[PDB]
Structure formats: C-alpha cells, structure tokens
Amino acid sequence: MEINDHQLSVAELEQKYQTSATKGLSASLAAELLLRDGPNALRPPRGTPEYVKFARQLAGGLQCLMWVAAAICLIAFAIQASEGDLTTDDNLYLALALIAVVVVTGCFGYYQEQQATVIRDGDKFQINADQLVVGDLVEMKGGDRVPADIRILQAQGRKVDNSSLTGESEPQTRSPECTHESPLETRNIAFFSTMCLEGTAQGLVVNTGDRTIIGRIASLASGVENEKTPIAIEIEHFVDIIAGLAILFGATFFIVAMCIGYTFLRAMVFFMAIVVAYVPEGLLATVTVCLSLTAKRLASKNCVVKNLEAVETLGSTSVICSDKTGTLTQNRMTVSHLWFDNHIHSADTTEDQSGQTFDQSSETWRALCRVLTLCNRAAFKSGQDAVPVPKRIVIGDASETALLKFSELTLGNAMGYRERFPKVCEIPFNSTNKFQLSIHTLEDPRDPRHVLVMKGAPERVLERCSSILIKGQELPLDEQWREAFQTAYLSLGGLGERVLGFCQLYLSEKDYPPGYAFDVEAMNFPTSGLSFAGLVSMIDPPRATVPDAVLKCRTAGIRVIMVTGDHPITAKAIAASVGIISEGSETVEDIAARLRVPVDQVNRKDARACVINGMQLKDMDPSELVEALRTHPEMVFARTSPQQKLVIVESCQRLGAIVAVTGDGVNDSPALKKADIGVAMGIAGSDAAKNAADMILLDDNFASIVTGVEQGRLIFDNLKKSIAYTLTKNIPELTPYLIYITVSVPLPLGCITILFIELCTDIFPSVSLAYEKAESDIMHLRPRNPKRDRLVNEPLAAYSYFQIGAIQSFAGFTDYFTAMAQEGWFPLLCVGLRPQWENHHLQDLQDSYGQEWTFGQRLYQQYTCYTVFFISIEMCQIADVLIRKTRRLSAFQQGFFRNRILVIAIVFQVCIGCFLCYCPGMPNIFNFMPIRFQWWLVPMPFGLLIFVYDEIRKLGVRCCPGSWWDQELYY
C-alpha cells in the first residue's frame, strides 16, 4: 500500500517541492523538473506483436503433445527410411497431420477469436495536461477531470466522483483538511482518473503520470497473474489419462513384440505405430467447435464473449466477490421517500419504475408537489423527449434534479407548472440561509394572488413554520407533531437518505397588491410562520434483473460477496435488496442493537451476515480476513479501496474457490485482473475495467452472468460424450494392426481407411453431440470442482477402450473373416500367412480351396477387407452415437430422437461411407473397394449388442445410484 504526505503542512509541502503556493513554479523550474523526473505519463508494456499472438496458441496444451507424436512418428520414419526402407506415406503423413492439426486447429481461434488549468507566476493559463508537473497549482471545477493526483489546498463546495477507486459514484466532498489517516479516504486528496462533479477547488500536484494512484493500478493490476480458465485446467486432465494409456500399451506392445521375435527395428516401429490409436486427433477441434457453437447461441442472447474458454467459467467457483458499482448496479440513483399527512411514503426509485404508486389523492401531496416543481431551478436539457425522464440529462445540482424528475414523472410537465405559476422573485439557496424560496403568481384565476414557496434544511424549515397542511387543511404545529416530524426526519436520515423540508404560504393579499414589489435583497415579506407541507428524502435503485440474477447464482451454490467503495449504510441496503443479504440474516451490530446489549457481548458466530468497513479491513491480517470469509455466508465489504478488493479476492482464492469478479470501474481493475474470470460492464464500464476483464457484458445485462455460468455446464458434459464417442473408434482402429503382428494375418485395416473414419465419418456425429440436452436439472447441481472432476477421466477411458471399443473391434474383425472366408480363405488358414500374402514375388498363393492367387488379386480382396472394416466401424459407430447421447438416461427417456443434428450425422455418415465404397476412382485414390450388400450386415449384431449392453448398464446405474457401476463407468 502507498505511504504519503497529507500530514505535511501546505508550507512544508512547498518546501519539499521547491514550489510557490500562490505563484506556482517558474517556467524555468518547471522545465528543469521535467527533465529530471520524466513525463507525466505511464510507461507501457510494448504493444504486443502479431507474430507472437499466433505462436503462443501453438503450444495450446494438446498442441505440444501432438508435436511429440509427430516428432516421434518421425522417429519411425527416420529409422525405417534408414535401415528398412519402406516406401510409404504411412508414418510420414501420419506424423504430418498431427502437427498441422495445430496450425489448422489454431486457425479456429484466429478465425473466431486534454488540457489543465494551472497557475504559474500568479496568472492562470490552460496547458497541455502532459505539461503538468509535481508542485504546480492546479484549478479544477465542476465538469472537469482531475488532471493528476492533487493535494487540496483550497476548495469551495467541491464534490468529486471516485468510482474509479471505489466503484461508488456518489459524490464526495473535497476540503483542505485531512479527514483520515488513509489517503484514499481523506478529503484533501483528489485523484487522477477521477472527475470533479461540482464546486471549485485548487490543489498542489503531488503525483504525475505513472506515479498517480490509478496511473499505477494498471501496471500493478495488469502485470498480475490473471489466472486461467477452469475449462483450460480441465482440458488437460483428460489428455494425461489418454497419454497414460497410449504409452502404457504402446510400450507394452514393444515388449510383447520382442518376446515374439521382433527386433529393435520392428518392436520400435510398433510402439510409435500404437499412437493414432491413443491420441484423439479430432478431440481438440471438437471441443473448440463446441465452445464456439455455444458462444454463438449466447451472442443471440445479447451476450458477447471475447474468449472461447469464457463460455464455461461459470461453474467451478465457491465464492464470488462482486464489485457493486457498474457491476451489480448500472450506476445511478434518486429520491426515495416523502413525509406528509404525518405518514412516511415511499416513491419508486427504479429506472423502469417497476414499483407502484404511493399516493395521488392527498391535497397535501399536490401542495408539496407544487413546491418541489416551483421552488426549483433545474431544467431538462433540450431535445430530451425521446428519452425517458430518469434517463435524461438535467442541468442543475443533484438534489434539484431529483425533485424535477420526481414531479415530471408523477405530476406531468414541470414546465407546465412553471408557466402556470410565473416566478416573480426568489431568493436562491444561500449558504447562510440554508433555504431557498420563491414567490409566484397563483394560476388560480380567482386568486391570482401571491404564493410563497421554500425548501431547505428540515430543521430550518420547521423553525419557520406556524401551521401544517394536513390533508387539505392547515393546523397548529403542536408539539405532538413537532415530534412526529422529528421521528420521520431521524428515520429517513437513518436510511442514509438526504432530507429536505418543504413549506409554503398563501400571502395575505392586503399587504401585497397585484402589482406589489418584492425585495429579495431585504425581506420585503414574511419569512416566518409558514405552513409546513412535508419532507422529501433520497434513495437509489439497482438494475432489474440483478436481484433475480443473484438469486439464481445462489441456487447454483455460488457465494455472492459485495465489494464496494461506497459507504456501508448504502451498501448494506442494496445487499438486502439484491439478496446478497437474506431476510432474517444478521450482523453482530444488528443483534446488539436489537438486544440492546454491547457488541462485545454478542457471540460472533450468531451472525451469519457481516459488513466490514475498509477502514477496519485495513487493520486486519490476512488470516483474519480468511476467518471472516470462512465464518460468514453473506458478506459485504464496504468502503474498500482497490487494493482491498484485490485482497478479498486473494483471500477467496486462498480458500481454493474459483472467483468471478464483476465490476464497472477503474477501482475494480486489480480485482478483475486477479479474478479467475473478470467480467466488465460494456456501456457504463470504464475503459480500464474493460481492458482488465475477460468478458464484457455489452448490454450491461447482469442476468447474462447466470447464462455465462450455465454455458460452462451443458457443453462441458456434452463434450465428454463427444470425447467418448470419438475415442471408442480408436480401439477398432488399433487392434487390427496389433493382431496383424501377433497373429501373422493379413492387415485388416489400413492407414488411409482410418483417416476417412476420423476425418470423414466420425466428424458429423462427434460434433452433433453438442446439441444434446440435459439429462437432469443442471442448475440444481453445485459447481464442479475443477481439481476433482475432470473433463476426461479414467472412467471414460475404460468405457471407450475397455468395453465399447472392444465390441467394436470384433465387429470389424468379423467382417474381415467373412470377406476372406467367402473368397476362399478360411480363418484357420489365415494364421501365419502374412509373409506369403505380403510377398510380392509370389503370384501363386494357394487358398484353402486350392486355388492360386496373384499378388494383385489377393490384394484386391484385402483392400476390400479394409473397406468393409471401415464400414463395420460406421455401423458400430451408429450404436456408439445413440448410447453416447446419454450418460445416465435411457434412450427411451432422453429420446435419442430429438437431436436432429445427431440423426443428420447418421445419414450423412453412412452416405459418405457408401460413397467411398461405390464411387469409381475411389479404388485407386483411396484403395476402397465396392462391397456386396451382404457385407453391410456383418457388424449388425455387434451394433445391436452395443446398444443393448449400454442400455442395460445405465438401467443398472439408475437403480443403484450409490455404488459400483456408476463409480466405475460413470464418466
């Protein structure tokens, strides 16, 4: 945290600075100081080059692993080309695809992814803001932006907006006197990246450029490990399991091959051979298209996602530390309550004005409304009518604008009133008077006599009144009412609302002629003994969807923590409003208040909810923070500095949770930058928050956050299904080569054949899984533990490889035997044949029958086998597709049927295979031969068994949720 000079006297400060308070630095001195220190500018990271952006992706996890395969596949090509020249594309091309998959895969992401007013030599002049240096005198007024960090020497009625630091917009006063030990808290310092809302002030520049509090946040919050995405972390667990098996078997097939009588030449080639089988080449692309496809839906939702990984990040978090202003809220506020007819009323604060009407009827109400509209200077900027009232910009102070907006809304045009009762004279609100009054000609034509209207400090207005308009009629101001007012005044004040008193007087016509002149300068007319009409307070409302959005997250099992720069009374009120604090929940202070016991007396454990001021937070050790975090379900950190927001997040992360920071302002930057995922508001959001964030809510629709979390759920599951679906086919692809070596039988399936499965046939089906629905109420479950529940786990491998893929292999092997057997080569004869079969020289090979086959002839038969094997997989893949559609549910229950995309997959997939078989040229180009109709049927019993086997298994899982089948098999 920073350490400073606010303690120093102004004179002391100048002494340190070698500057003059009145005159400011000399032109000569300013220049000298410039060269010494450097410019009032932030030192950048460099822009980031285009080349590097692409290159970083090239590693992308699986990408590197794929390199090891390609390189290792080259290990095969190198040894082979050397010692045993096998002229073939097999290992070379095999190796090539793996790497290129990254270059082509990487594309998926690339294709989808000022002036200041200073005083120098006693004269003020405007200068390029960069020219500002520490020491000079700067003047700021309402509407301006603070040019640099400043020490307030002098100020008049100056208010500032420090949302950049706090995230809270309500204006803060600036005075020369140091308010608090904390520099972020004190009144005497005005910070760059902040704007003077109103008033005028002068201060001495303490810090410039990078040195300012915010001018560093970026570097401190930017150069911070913005952590990664829960999805990225998960997409690595599966690959390790996959690699684990690929290596186990790959090598195991080295040793086994060795015992059988294969050399270092042969045993080695197999190990590397054993790859295309364990590594899913298709998987990266699928996950990406899945992520990309989901993002598209969200876009349709009016929810734009900058990062693919961002689609999921919405589910593996325990606690969420949210910034209030611009994150939870849209950034705004207004009036709130009125007191008249000895009763407290509540106006609708909402933008939408979704609330209800409090009171039209009272005669009192109108008299009050009259003063609010008349004793009021504010005006709406011109050309507003298109926009709604609460939205439109008004010229005038906040309190007056509030009254104007209130009346315009409930009353109709204010201008109408202003016209109907012309303003003759008024005494503008004085600092001393603490009240503002006006005199107006009454619209009432019988009367058009003079009416006096005034407003100001509630205590002051009361000092001024004789009577009270209760209902339509006036009444003496008995002590009884004097208190009822006093109670209302205290209560509304408690709400954290600003309160104004209102009263009017029907002037006695005799004393005031129609012409009668009034004197604003000296009380030409009565200031005292007036009729007190009522009270009006203030208040602020949050977005519409937010309370529900908060509710949804909580059901999700997500902890929502407010983290705001704003003051605690306000923070807590909204916390209750949004649901961060639930009804009945209590802080220690509320208990002590109700009990009327001391705080020391209250047991902290009794309080579920907490509200911690930044000033207090500052004193606490991180362990203390951790306990507060552990100890409470509903937490509100208020009046927090930007660094504090960061600490909370770190504290939350220390627990192990995945935290999403949602915020709008420059003050949220370090937090957003720290969060596992930073979400920023698109419209309201400062540029800084936007740069800091992972995601932008273009709409400022908070509800989108719920969708975001949801997006990380359905697809995550559906992705596993697509992995399972893709991986299963690996087995039927691997086994033929192995048996080929072990059995010494002719090669059942070829390298080219595999590619058509992986690149052609499996693709649409695999992708189609994304369309799958929820088997259960996904929202109902807790977020996944990123560490514990991986995307690809051992239960997936066992299911894909051990069971299902195994059934698939036999289906393929069967077609193999049928084709050869039909051809005259019975299975028994097949063993040990490959050497003769492969032997190019022998034109003579004798089959079981006794016939003799040439080299080409038998080869055509084998190629036909390659073709039928290919087909067998597609037939079995149909079953795998249907079963993969659901993890728990029966096809009957889910209806395998609804997914249109999936069904499209079966038809097109089969069409492709038939094409490869039937089309002419395919026999040369891809060595695919035509298949007799009978050949199509061979795998059919195998396909059916798979469907039944899985269906039976899931029925088991459902019946006994607790135990074994689920434990082993359940993805």
Added chain:
Amino acid sequence: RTLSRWVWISLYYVAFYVVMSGIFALCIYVLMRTIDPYTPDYQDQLKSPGVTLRPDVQEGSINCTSEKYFFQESFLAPNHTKFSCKFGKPCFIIKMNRIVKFLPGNSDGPPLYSLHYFPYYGKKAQPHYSNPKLLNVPRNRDVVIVCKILAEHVSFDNPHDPYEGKVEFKLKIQK
C-alpha cells in the same frame, strides 16, 4: 482402486466378457452355417485368374489327353472324391491359379494349358488334384520378360495386380 470389492469387478467381467465372447462366437457360428463346404459365396475377387510361377520371385488318378473340359458331375459329396487327371538359361514353370468351376475358354524385345483339367472341383471335392526355358543367347544383363496368358476369360490389370494372368520377371545370369 478399491478393496474387498475387486471381487465385484473380476467376477463381473468373468461372466460379461464371457457373455460377449459367447455372443461373438454365437454370430460367427451362425454365419459359418450359411456357407457351402465345397464352394465360396463370392468367386468375384478371384474373377480373372492370375498366373504364378515356381521361381521364388500318382496312384489311382486318371490318364488323360489334350482335349475338352471334363465334367465330374455336380459339386457334391454323394460321389466320392472326384477323379483327377494325371500330369544357366534358367527354366521357369508357370501354372494357372485354380478357381472352382472356371473353364478357361479356348475349346521383339531383346534377345532371348489343357482344357481337360477344368473345371477344378476344389480341394474338398478333389484332394490330390493336379493342376497343369530361357536358353537365350544373351547373358550378364537384366532382362525383363513378361509371360502372359490369353483367353476371353482371362483379363489383365496393368495398373493393378501385375500378376493377373501374367508374370514380370528380370532374369540375370551373370557368368
């Protein structure tokens, strides 16, 4: 990784992989049923005969003469084994790949079958069935020679099985 539950795993697969081998075999054995003992379901692969040669690149029986095809009868077991007819500058021997019920039809480069045999009945039907010189001037060089057979029934696949109905070999007698 469990304990006192592995018995629930081992026993599972024992009679699940059991059930599956049992079904897999179940379907091979049905398939096998629907094939002739004497003749494959598809001849088509073998459709044109290939020609292969010797150089690695009779008691009982019947006396015969060069003549027309001899029909043994149908391809059936009711008759016993169908009777079969009797039968430097390297010598190479050529034969025609045997194909059941196939009747072959018949009724300068550098310097360098009887119908009575067919149709071939097949091994089951005919076990000890018997199917039916380059003195050249040149030497110390690689000579490419292609021996081939002709017939309407015979076809060649130049682009593919160079074996189909023909040979291609490169003799070299370096002396």
